[PDB]
Design a binder for this molecule. Structure first.
Ligand SMILES: C[C@H](N)[C@@H](CCCCCC(=O)O)CC(=O)O
Ligand SMILES: C[C@H](N)[C@@H](CCCCCC(=O)O)CC(=O)O
Lengths: 328, 328
């Protein structure tokens, strides 16, 4: 596959998409050929120049401003029809809550076939993609949903851990995030503030940077989120592991420190066939960033998705359903 | 599937096979219809009476002595041709080191198609099954190898954990086992003593219970095993995650205490795309027995294997390659 690498694209070029591009750079079996943001796109069948695209984006507002870039207010539509791309990572803020589904309906409408991957967080966003299962399948698209850190990595770990038990009692995810680069987080931070007490997507999305800084001042830069609406729950339910109500997700983001404020882990509790109650724990290393734990799994699921696609398996899959494949 | 459960069988009815039978009892989507040991077999398309089979085995030396049992010195051959069985768990001591492969060659020769699962430990035993890949595929058999605790559960956890990293440095497995029931462990204990310093399969297999008790007396019932030949290594290599030399397996079995002498875990170390070195850790609950952590995953892989089989996917798969499916 070093002779014929998987040709991939990234939609959305905020902090996560940019990290995704950097992660792809040293891969030999995967090549980044396509990036789109809201106001432009960049295609390069020979492989994207990541430094140039990042410069363009951060200094001129869009990758359409990069060498070989194209400005466009229909960048996704234009990009889909421009290039030979085997799969895309949808690194798109789900703002509003319908956006990911709407982008997916454009892939469907386009006639394009291949693999799509997302790192959606919200159960209700994942439910919108579930409504599209047959449309995806009929379109010839293998869609990998919730394939980030959580849902994703931690969800798959819980699916594996569950095999020791006759019955599952609880899957509890606690995450920590330290923000190293403010620019890389603003434009997703409202997605998180929406999980705050007395907030929601519409309210958070409409906040000014002034109002955000004010909220953060109160809690010293810390967003402690409990019992989040998080698609891990329906994913583990669709995989037959447990009911969604037995899955709980919470976490802490420290907007003022690059160090994780706590060690991310998932605890899986259940009863074994011998009637013993016990828990497995999967814990992430403190020096693995949000970016690595989201984008790493995302492309491992893209690779896995492609394997499925190449076997004629189309439709919607979750992180809980298949083994991601290590990308080299 | 409660109307048409997967009909499964177990070959070998020492401690692990017996535990496997008990684990299957409450399942509604999987039904134990077939058990064989060296000197007899038991088939019952309506579902095995586990208490009766265990009584027969432990009190009369074979399940062939159970109500509906048949004595036979070709029990595997006879069983394969007797019943409608969708998949078998091969709960067989690999003694000698060629035995599992030889049983597998009988399934091949028989014309039977379906799923086979094992919980093999040794790299060299797994390599013998790798030589049979095409024979398996041509025979219409989906073979799931190394699908126990380690290899198996812990190997799959390492495969998932690896997705955060650009390069893997080390996968380190440390296991603990407390023996609760001596009868349930003797007849596999020689497999472990073979990993001892200054021992091997042939030497260990030829030891008398006298000589075993003597060895154990020296170390107070404790078998501390380091750098074991363990198939986790080639499995993670075949899945493209790391070289076999970066996988190390050790553990402790306490023959004199039902409590685990240490907490079983796997530590996965690597470098992320940002150049940070870090480790994830997956730890098992102390009250999850060897039996639960081996047999639970084994049947989850059988179920997964069947899914593959039903899609026309035949040949050899490892725990590292696919997501096991929770059996209810
Ligand atoms: C709050 C985040 N946006 C996200 C979780 C990131 C988990 C990272 C795990 C780690 O790197 O340890 C959850 C969310 O967006 O709801
Ligand atoms: C020594 C064992 N036979 C076996 C490991 C059992 C791991 C159980 C894990 C747990 O229950 O914590 C390894 C071996 O046989 O080589």
């Amino acid at each position: 596959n070093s002779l014929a690498p998987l040709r991939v694209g990234i939609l959305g070029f905020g902090g996560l998409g940019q990290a995704a591009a950097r992660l792809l750079a040293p891969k030999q079996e995967m090549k980044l050929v396509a990036v789109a943001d809201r106001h432009g796109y960049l295609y390069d069948a020979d492989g994207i120049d990541v430094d140039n695209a990042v410069q363009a984006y951060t200094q001129q507002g869009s990758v359409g401003k990069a060498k070989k870039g194209q400005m466009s207010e229909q960048s996704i539509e234009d990009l889909i029809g421009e290039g030979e791309v085997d799969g895309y990572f949808l690194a798109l803020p789900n703002l509003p809550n319908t956006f990911m589904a709407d982008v997916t309906r454009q892939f469907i409408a386009s006639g394009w076939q291949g693999v799509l991957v997302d790192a959606l967080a919200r159960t209700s966003a994942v439910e919108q993609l579930i409504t599209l299962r047959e449309d995806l399948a009929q379109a010839g698209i293998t869609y990998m949903t919730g394939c980030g850190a959580t849902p994703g990595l931690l969800t798959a770990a819980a699916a594996i851990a569950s095999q020791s038990f006759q019955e599952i009692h609880q899957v509890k995810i606690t995450f920590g995030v330290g923000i190293a680069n403010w620019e890389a987080y603003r434009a997703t931070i409202r997605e998180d503030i929406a999980h705050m007490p007395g907030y929601n997507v519409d309210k958070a999305q409409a906040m000014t940077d002034a109002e955000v800084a004010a909220l953060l001042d109160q809690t010293n830069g810390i967003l402690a989120l409990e019992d989040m609406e998080h698609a891990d729950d329906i994913m583990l339910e669709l995989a037959g592991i447990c009911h969604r109500d037995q899955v709980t997700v919470g976490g802490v983001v420290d907007t003022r420190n690059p160090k994780k404020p706590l060690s991310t882990h998932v605890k899986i509790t259940g009863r074994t066939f011998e009637g013993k109650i016990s828990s497995h724990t999967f814990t992430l290393g403190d020096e693995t960033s949000m970016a690595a734990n989201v984008c790493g799994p995302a492309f491992g699921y893209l690779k896995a998705g492609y394997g499925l696609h190449r076997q004629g398996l189309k439709g919607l899959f979750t992180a809980a359903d298949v083994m991601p494949k290590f990308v080299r």
